[PDB]
Structure formats: structure tokens, C-alpha cells
Design a binder for this molecule. Structure first.
Ligand SMILES: Cc1cn([C@H]2C[C@H](O)[C@@H](COP(=O)(O)OP(=O)(O)OP(=O)(O)O)O2)c(=O)[nH]c1=O
Ligand SMILES: Cc1cn([C@H]2C[C@H](O)[C@@H](COP(=O)(O)OP(=O)(O)OP(=O)(O)O)O2)c(=O)[nH]c1=O
Ligand SMILES: Cc1cn([C@H]2C[C@H](O)[C@@H](COP(=O)(O)OP(=O)(O)OP(=O)(O)O)O2)c(=O)[nH]c1=O
Ligand SMILES: [Mg+2]
Ligand SMILES: [Mg+2]
Ligand SMILES: [Mg+2]
Lengths: 177, 177, 177
């Protein structure tokens, strides 16, 4: 079943689930809002002519001290949540944008289910689908997690992104198969 | 998790859930198709240079009497469902495009879970990802809802978009934090 | 509930669910990775001026023998999984991109729930959101399925895309009502 916000609170309190740092008002009817962090990554368009899955891609990364960041029209940017999340083996969580955000043409393209056992901040794929730039304010609620129960024995997440911090560039080129 | 189409039909007939107006053939194996309404909103590019999360953004809104609307290439547009949806406290619903629509490069970017207790029409985020314009026919099935049960005590949706009608502009600037 | 990877394995071995061809390492904590096939479809820009929901749209389709394909910047392309999937009536599956892929600006826009009873390859909606072209390697893991149980009686999928093979163009023009 999808977990109610209240159930999410209970599980946090009992440490079945960790989401930190967190304010109680981030808890929603059946989701929890997460916030935009100060750290960003973009593909280095001056150095790379083509994007590849078979080798590392050069990129620029930075932490801003400003209150906002600008995302220009039709531009893609990697960001991160302030929150570090730790899921036990029997939960998964669907990351999605907040409706208020998507309605301004900011698409959280990374929308998907977090592997049970995942431990880290959440890397976000931001796309400005408008013809105008968007000013993103750091620390504002940008996306949310919807939790669901997993049935059966679980082999927990042991992949590339365990313990990730910051907007974390793809490591697709490490695929063993 | 997920309610079968038949279960959705039952819950509708017993008024546990409301979706209206509705034809029986909108009911699918484990989803229900919703239709594109005549009402649209776009950002007022003659008055705004930059999109902000901290104040209202001016916009143009209109209802068309034409059978179709044209969405030009690489353009983003807010739309709405014809259907008004009312969810009880123990159900949530995932909005997503229909595969037939996404395959023509029309992306329903607003894909996500509706808060338990939500009551209103659904605002859609349309993006034409082609280099050609798309003719969207009004009243055609454009997206669908996938229903899931919620476990635990629920504080129902009391947010910005309760009772929304029409394509409804973002009210992100009303965030308390 | 969402099925664990182990549960997915069991159901495969007992033929409750079919996904073929498949390597055991495609199985993940609570999902299964699928691979990019060699077959592609693009809208025929030399023959169509406008995209329509009301008639067939001309397109070019091809199978590549090359190891990679190039998707130019801000371009949308239809692709397919290598895997054929057959779902019984009591399961549904959420298709989504792999985080490693989305982080390079390749969006799997078709993200959504597969109808119970669906039988076919999965057609993917690829969008390159970067300013650089992307080289997609054929046969690499590109997306994944997250399985969920369906509660209640099910009328199985009897729609347009039963038995689909290859990147399969939209048949939206076949809608009744
Ligand atoms: C959905 C999502 C996942 N993730 C994290 C949580 C997941 O457990 C983790 C892996 O997602 P996957 O989709 O499994 O990514 P992957 O297959 O490319 O990585 P691996 O080969 O290691 O499996 O990525 C984000 O950082 N942001 C997101 O938006
Ligand atoms: C989500 C997804 C579905 N599909 C397939 C599996 C689904 O059972 C099938 C239908 O999804 P739908 O979203 O129902 O598409 P539709 O309503 O446009 O088509 P129909 O009228 O036939 O119902 O499409 C893909 O090929 N790729 C995908 O990414
Ligand atoms: C997913 C979705 C939700 N909605 C509506 C129904 C949801 O219950 C409602 C809220 O979505 P949320 O993501 O909670 O919106 P928000 O957090 O930006 O707004 P609030 O601060 O009020 O929570 O928006 C749409 O109009 N279209 C959609 O595609
Ligand atoms: Mg909200
Ligand atoms: Mg359908
Ligand atoms: Mg993975």
C-alpha cells in the first residue's frame, strides 16, 4: 500500500526510515516534501561534443552561496535534495515534483522508484521547459517522496550511488553488463 | 497496490470515489482514462521576463470553442481534464499520459500521485517535444489515473489547489516555507 | 505491494510472468532492468507539417547494425526494449529510466504503468534534453520495470498495442470516442 503521511511520521520516529534534516510540515497527506540543495552539476558543453555511456563525461560542479540559481530556457541541470534518505529493505519511494513546480514548467525528470535499502541524498534532473529562465530558490520544497511497501525477500541496493552526496554525475560507464 | 478497473467501477457506483463526467469505456484494465478540456493557461511573455517562485507570475488564460488547439514545437502549456475527481482519504491516484500520446512527442510532465482527499479537476503540464506543431483535439482521452490504497491514518489534502477548476496556474509563492 | 527482485525471479522461473531474453543480473532490489533494442522510429519531417491525433502520421523506421545510434540535441525518438514482456492479469509494472541515464539528459518520457495482461516489447519515448548529441549504445540497460500486484477482478489488456514488436508508432487515431 502507499504509506499515509502519518505512517511515514511514525516510521521516522521509530527509525524504520530516516529522512534528515526534516521539518514536520514537510509531511503531506501521502507523501513527504524534500528541498533543493545548494549543489549543482552541468555537462561541460565546451569540452564534450557528444554524450557517451561508455566513458566519463566532463562536467562542471558548484555550490552556490546565493539564495537562488537561474536555469535558462530548455536547459537541463543536475541538483540535489538537502535531505539524506535511508530506506529499509521493505520500502521503496517514488520521487516526483510538486505540482506547483511542474506548473511553472520546471520538470523533475528523474521521477522514479528508489531502490529498497538506498542510502543517500537524492539527485534531481531539472529541466526548464519554458521559453523564460526560471529562478530556483535554494532550500525551497521542490519534490516529494511517495512511499510504498515491498513484499518478499529483498536483496538491498548495492549499486553505484550508495552514500551519494551532492548532485552526483552519472556513472553509467561503470556498468558491468 | 493497485485497483483494477473493475474495482474502480464498483467504488464509483458506491460513491466511495467520484470522477465526473465519465463514460464507462474510459475504464481500463487497471486505470481510468481522462479527457482534455477546452481551457488553457500560458505564461504572459509580454509582461514577464523571468519565472519566479516568490511572487505571482502574470498569465493568459482562455477557453477555446475550436475543436482543436495547436501546441507549437518545444512549447509548454497548461491544460485541464474535463473530469472532476474527488478522492476519499484512503486512496491516491497516479496521473500519467497515455502511451499513444507520449509516442507522438506530447509529454504529460505532471505525472505524479494525487493527495488523498483531493477534490478538483486535474491540471496538466503539456510539452510538445517535436519540431512540428501538434493539433490536440479537445475532449479526447489524453491521460489516465492509476489508483492505489493508502495505509494508515490520513490528514487529507488542505492545500492550494482544493476545488480547482480550469487549467490552474501555480501558486508556489504561497508556500509557508 | 511492490514485488522484490527476488519475488520477480521466482515468478519468472515459475512462468507466472515472462520477460525474455533476460540475464539474472538485470534483476535489481525491487525492479528489473531492460535493454535498448536496435529498432527505431522517427516522425517523417519531410512528409508531415503538423502532428495529428486523427490520422496516421508518416514515419521512418530502421534497424541499426551499428553498436550505437546518435540522438541529436532536443530531439525525440521512439525506441524499443530487447525484452518481450508478458504480464498476467494480476500484475502491473511501472516503466522508468535508470537514474544513470536520466542524469545524462536522456529522458525516458514514456514512464507509466503497463496494463495487466499486456504482452509485447516495450516502446520507449526517448528525449535528448542536452545541447549535445548523445550516442546510445544498443543492448545496454536503459530502463527498468517495477512490479505491483493488482487487487480485484481484472479485464485484461485488449488495446491497440497487444503483441507489439519494435518501436511501435502511435495508433491514437484508432480511438473510439
Ligand atoms: C529515482 C531516483 C533515484 N536516485 C537514486 C536512488 C536509487 O536507489 C539509485 C539507483 O537508481 P537506478 O534507477 O537503479 O539507477 P542505476 O541503475 O543507473 O544505478 P545502479 O546501476 O547503481 O542500480 O539512484 C536518485 O538519486 N534520484 C532519483 O530521482
Ligand atoms: C508505459 C508503457 C506502456 N506501453 C504499452 C503497454 C501498455 O499496456 C500499452 C497501453 O498503454 P496505455 O497508456 O493504455 O496507452 P493507450 O491508452 O494510448 O493505448 P490503448 O488505447 O491500447 O489502451 O502500451 C509501452 O509500450 N511503453 C511504455 O512505456
Ligand atoms: C499530480 C497532479 C496533481 N494535481 C493536483 C492534485 C494534487 O492533490 C494537488 C497537489 O499536488 P502537490 O504536488 O502536493 O502540489 P504542491 O505541493 O505544489 O501544492 P500544495 O502546496 O497544495 O501541496 O495538485 C494536478 O492538478 N495535476 C497533476 O498532474
Ligand atoms: Mg503538496
Ligand atoms: Mg490505455
Ligand atoms: Mg539500478
Amino acid at each position: 500500500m502507499i504509506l499515509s503521511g502519518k505512517t511515514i511520521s511514525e516510521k521516522l520516529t521509530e527509525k524504520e526510515l530516516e529522512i534528515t534534516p526534516l521539518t514536520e510540515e514537510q509531511i503531506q497527506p501521502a507523501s513527504v516534501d524534500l528541498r533543493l540543495g545548494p549543489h549543482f552539476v552541468t555537462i561541460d558543453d565546451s569540452k564534450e561534443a557528444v554524450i557517451s555511456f561508455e566513458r566519463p563525461i566532463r562536467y562542471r560542479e558548484w555550490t552556490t552561496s546565493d539564495e537562488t540559481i537561474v536555469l535558462p530556457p530548455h536547459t537541463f541541470l543536475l541538483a540535489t535534495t538537502m535531505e539524506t534518505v535511508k530506506l529499509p529493505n521493505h520500502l521503496t519511494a517514488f520521487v516526483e515534483g510538486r505540482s506547483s513546480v511542474g506548473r511553472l514548467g520546471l520538470f523533475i525528470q528523474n521521477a522514479g522508484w528508489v531502490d529498497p535499502g538506498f542510502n543517500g541524498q537524492i539527485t534531481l534532473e531539472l529541466f526548464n521547459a519554458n521559453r523564460l529562465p526560471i529562478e530556483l530558490p535554494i532550500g525551497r520544497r521542490i519534490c516529494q517522496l511517495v512511499f510504498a511497501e515491498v513484499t518478499g525477500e529483498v536483496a538491498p541496493y548495492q549499486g553505484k550511488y550508495l552514500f551519494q552526496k551532492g548532485a552526483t554525475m552519472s556513472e553509467i560507464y561503470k556498468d558491468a553488463f
